């Protein structure tokens, strides 16, 4: 409804802010692993622990909605505007692949960090927002648990 | 109908696609079709 708990390692996000904008750099965005390959990991991580039918149904609904939701948002309001011309660069390479399978989970966590300010634009009920923010913060924790192969380690200082 | 100079999506400058219903002029790259003059 108003609050998340970003664990004090993703010191990364604001760094992400600097390079793309001030210390001019870029992320070339054919990526492996992709968003879709990590949700389908955390799902398989946690869904082995949920007990009742209610829990597994709501988890499945949220995850499917999340792949589709990252799809529909990734274009219009998830890029720093320097990864914008390069977005046009990549939009000509792959024309037959959905946006939910070309980016690593570093844009997804931008969604995770900006979600509550978006649930404060809709008239959801307390349990919808409660379970939603619970799941995404658990995802942030799982990501900081495995950031070896998930986050990038270098930046692509590229031409305009 | 006076389209404001700066971008409607980020705040930059350049040539943008005009809009009559609203003086909103987004960058040709700041839409959600990512397109050059293609379309
Ligand atoms: Zn408008
Ligand atoms: Zn723009």
From Swiss-Prot, chain A:
Q: Where in the cell is it found?
A: Nucleus
Q: Where is the signal peptide?
A: none
**Top-rank taxon, per record:** Eukaryota
Domain annotation MRG: ranges: 1-160
Which family does the record assign? Belongs to the MRG family.
The function of this protein is:
Component of the NuA4 histone acetyltransferase complex which is involved in transcriptional activation of selected genes principally by acetylation of nucleosomal histone H4 and H2A. The NuA4 complex is also involved in DNA repair. Also involved in deacetylation of histones, chromatin assembly and chromosome segregation. May act as a transcriptional oscillator, directing histone deacetylases to specific chromosomal domains.
Subunit structure comment from the entry: Component of the NuA4 histone acetyltransferase complex. Heterotetramer of alp13, clr6, prw1 and pst2.
Q: What is this protein called?
A: Chromatin modification-related protein eaf3
Q: Which gene encodes it?
A: alp13
Complete protein: which residues are present? 169 to 329 of 337
UniProtKB/Swiss-Prot annotation, chain B:
- Describe, by residue range, where the zinc fingers (PHD-type) fall in the chain: 4-39
The lineage's top-level taxon is: Eukaryota
Q: What is this protein called?
A: Uncharacterized protein C16C9.05
Organism of origin is: Schizosaccharomyces pombe (strain 972 / ATCC 24843) (Fission yeast)
């Amino acid at each position: 409804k108003h609050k998340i708990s970003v664990p004090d390692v993703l010191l990364w996000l604001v760094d992400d802010w600097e390079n793309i904008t001030k210390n001019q750099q870029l992320i070339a965005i054919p990526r492996n692993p992709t968003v879709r390959a990590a949700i389908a990991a955390f799902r398989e991580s946690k869904i082995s622990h949920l007990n009742n039918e209610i829990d597994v149904d709501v988890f499945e609904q949220a995850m499917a909605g999340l792949v589709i939701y990252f799809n529909k948002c990734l274009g219009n309001m998830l890029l720093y505007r320097f990864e914008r011309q390069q977005y046009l660069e990549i939009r000509q390479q792959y024309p037959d692949t959905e946006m939910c399978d070309l980016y690593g989970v570093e844009h997804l966590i931008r969604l995770f960090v900006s979600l509550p300010e978006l649930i404060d634009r809709t008239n959801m009920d307390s349990q919808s927002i409660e379970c939603l923010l619970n799941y995404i913060e658990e995802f942030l924790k799982y990501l900081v648990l495995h950031k070896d192969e998930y986050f990038i380690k270098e930046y692509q200082n590229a031409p305009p | 109908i006076r389209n404001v100079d700066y971008c409607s999506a980020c705040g930059g400058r350049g040539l943008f696609i005009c809009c009559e219903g609203c003086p909103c002029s987004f960058h040709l790259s700041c839409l959600e079709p990512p397109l050059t003059p293609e379309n």
